[PDB]
Amino acid sequence: CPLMVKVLDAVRGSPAINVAVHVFRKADTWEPFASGKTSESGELHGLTTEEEFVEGIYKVEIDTKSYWKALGISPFHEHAEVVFTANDSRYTIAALLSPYSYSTTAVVT
Amino acid sequence: CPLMVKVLDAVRGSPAINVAVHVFRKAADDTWEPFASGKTSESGELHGLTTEEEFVEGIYKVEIDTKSYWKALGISPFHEHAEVVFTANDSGPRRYTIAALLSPYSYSTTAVVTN
Numbered sequence: 001c002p003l004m005v006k007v008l009d010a011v012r013g014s015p016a017i018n019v020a021v022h023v024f025r026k027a028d029t030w031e032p033f034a035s036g037k038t039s040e041s042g043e044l045h046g047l048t049t050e051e052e053f054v055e056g057i058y059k060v061e062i063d064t065k066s067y068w069k070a071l072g073i074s075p076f077h078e079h080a081e082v083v084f085t086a087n088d089s090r091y092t093i094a095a096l097l098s099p100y101s102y103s104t105t106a107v108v109t
Numbered sequence: 110c111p112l113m114v115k116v117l118d119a120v121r122g123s124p125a126i127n128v129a130v131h132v133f134r135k136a137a138d139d140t141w142e143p144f145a146s147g148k149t150s151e152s153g154e155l156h157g158l159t160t161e162e163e164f165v166e167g168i169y170k171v172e173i174d175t176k177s178y179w180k181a182l183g184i185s186p187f188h189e190h191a192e193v194v195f196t197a198n199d200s201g202p203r204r205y206t207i208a209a210l211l212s213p214y215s216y217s218t219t220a221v222v223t224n
């Protein structure tokens with residue numbers, strides 16, 4: 001599992017459950033690559049395989065807007081967007097969500 | 110000044126000076142049109158990107174060029190940039206401050222919206 005995403009809710013103090021996440025790879029346009037929804041643990045595994053996940057620029061779009069929308073909280077952002085170059089020389093993208101703010105970090109091991 | 114950007118550096122505890130910032134607005138075909146751009150000053154602030162007349166309702170993307178920043182300091186960062194996408198002025202005109210806090214493998218962004 002070369003790419004995992006983990007999403008937390010800073011208002012509720014909980015994982016962010018059932019959040020839609022779309023990954024794109026840069027082709028100079030954006031092409032769909034993977035997607036899924038976070039689990040009960042706020043996690044998204046099995047997006048891609050080592051074979052598929054080659055060097056390149058990737059964008060992870062976290063559909064935070066629909067997440068806040070579904071609990072009746074007014075959100076600011078359309079989404080959280082995390083753009084990074086993946087290089088061969090294992091990635092967890094973690095995001096921490098609030099209605100008017102978000103934080104993201106990469107754990108690369 | 111309806112749209113301001115402030116950028117801080119979490120490694121050095123200082124404003125993030127001379128950081129490029131590009132703002133785009135979503136167009137009538139779901140593409141991103143260039144809207145405004147500039148560079149942060151000594152205080153890590155970017156003022157004068159737009160005017161209230163130009164800053165109409167829409168979906169805007171503020172892209173902070175964190176990669177050239179970190180490279181100009183001699184550091185290899187993770188992200189290509191920091192991005193913030195949001196709808197503005199949807200219920201009338203507002204004043205927006207977009208603040209970002211930068212680390213080589215992380216960033217945070219927050220929005221302060223005034224009437």
Ligand SMILES: O=C(O)CCO/N=C/c1ccccc1C(F)(F)F
Nearest residue numbers: 006008092094095096103104105107
């Ligand atoms: O799976 C993992 O590596 C750990 C998940 O936890 N993520 C935490 C986290 C993520 C983004 C911004 C701020 C934080 C925090 F520091 F505030 F908590």
Ligand SMILES: O=C(O)CCO/N=C/c1ccccc1C(F)(F)F
Nearest residue numbers: 115117206208209210217218219221
């Ligand atoms: O100019 C403004 O509106 C506020 C400027 O300061 N920004 C602070 C800030 C921004 C993003 C994440 C975390 C923080 C922080 F609180 F942790 F430091």
